[PDB]
Design a protein around this ligand. Sequence first.
Ligand code: ANP
Ligand code: BGC
Ligand code: MG
Length: 456
Amino acid sequence: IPMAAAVIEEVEQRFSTPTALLRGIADAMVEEMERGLRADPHAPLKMLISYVDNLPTGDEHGLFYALDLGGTNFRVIRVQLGGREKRVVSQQYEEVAIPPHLMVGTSMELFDFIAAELESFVKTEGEDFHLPEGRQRELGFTFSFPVHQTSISSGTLIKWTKGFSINGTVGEDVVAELSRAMERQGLDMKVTALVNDTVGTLAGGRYVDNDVAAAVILGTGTNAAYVEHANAIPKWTGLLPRSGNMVINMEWGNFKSERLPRSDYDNALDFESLNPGEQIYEKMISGMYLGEIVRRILLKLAHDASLFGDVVPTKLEQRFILRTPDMSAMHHDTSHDLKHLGAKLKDILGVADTSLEARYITLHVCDLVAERGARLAAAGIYGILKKLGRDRVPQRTVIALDGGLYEHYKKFRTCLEATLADLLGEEAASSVVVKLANDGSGIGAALLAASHSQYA
Ligand SMILES: Nc1ncnc2c1ncn2[C@@H]1O[C@H](COP(=O)(O)OP(=O)(O)NP(=O)(O)O)[C@@H](O)[C@H]1O
Ligand SMILES: OC[C@H]1O[C@@H](O)[C@H](O)[C@@H](O)[C@@H]1O
Ligand SMILES: [Mg+2]
């Protein structure tokens, strides 16, 4: 009991997110949104111009391929599109898990593995897909890392995030990197668009619902994109676009702010991370990191309060051994003896048996960790709504979501929705909609490759 409670009291203190604070944080997010838009050097929110001035209409048609590369897997995709009525006539896809090594080897090894799937996936092309003879297959590239765009279809990698760390490629143009690798496979294809996963998901959403203003990811990582007025971007240099509109990638993963309620655990996780100092907000909320925070809190407990016996289990000292899908397993156990939770602990801590009070303390720790992440992510979405002036009534505003964290972690999902609504107040909340646009970055990129064909 009592040694355990001192450290839980300390977690509760440190992780606290009283709504008042959440609004504080939302505000800060907007300030930072503004600094990023002013080219303000070393703004933590980059607010990257996508070169996307037109989101999908509906009216798109043709064959288009997409390649979506993520934190933990990539997808190859095709769609046959038949205009405003028929729309999305046919679509296939393959998803492959990225091998750990390819996160941390060479650029070449990576895009080769990607391209090789793409190539073998194209072969299997049925005949409910077709493209005028003479013609070249075109391809939308979803790239789930922060790029500095140079055109719709070109851009240089700023920095790797969330478990990637490949030395060659920072500062290089990623589409050229893909292209070389594709052609090394004897694969005639063009990249006609290059987008972040948040942008893709915004395009996919808008294609089925015209009131989509924004898209958040909550998966291995977290990030958000929204449609911004081009005349509200000081660092814009050039001709304004016809639409009056530019989609921004906030890269809010990199938000930091004294207002963020952080712990030793968060400090230590960062210290031993692939990208120390970076993506500090993300590391409080996204899926690559939640299980690891839980582990570290449990490790303090096993040490300072014998929580799991007189010796701490070896396995509990392994970094990353407790993943976030395991965490949501434990979290959603409603049994009286917490059976299922216990089965997971046995498995992960490599222990034989568990106190039932120990099982209730684990569940509590899971609760605090997911709760902070979800409440903080809600503050971010509220931040966006503020930027769009849809935080108030005088209007239907849809926010597209994607990512396994959000799709599969039920309590994380509903904590985020309850809190968003709390922040918006009643009146304003009836205006906004959070909708699953799962695997939406993939299609969103094909759609945008359409608008930018070399053909009509
Ligand atoms: N059942 C689950 N409970 C909680 N989290 C989950 C669950 N399933 C998956 N996740 C998280 O979400 C991720 C699953 O893949 P996905 O959401 O497609 O992200 P990704 O494309 O690999 N990387 P990113 O593009 O940054 O989201 C994993 O990294 C997990 O951390
Ligand atoms: O996948 C969700 C997000 O993860 C973040 O950590 C990446 O830096 C973003 O580029 C991406 O949108
Ligand atoms: Mg994705």
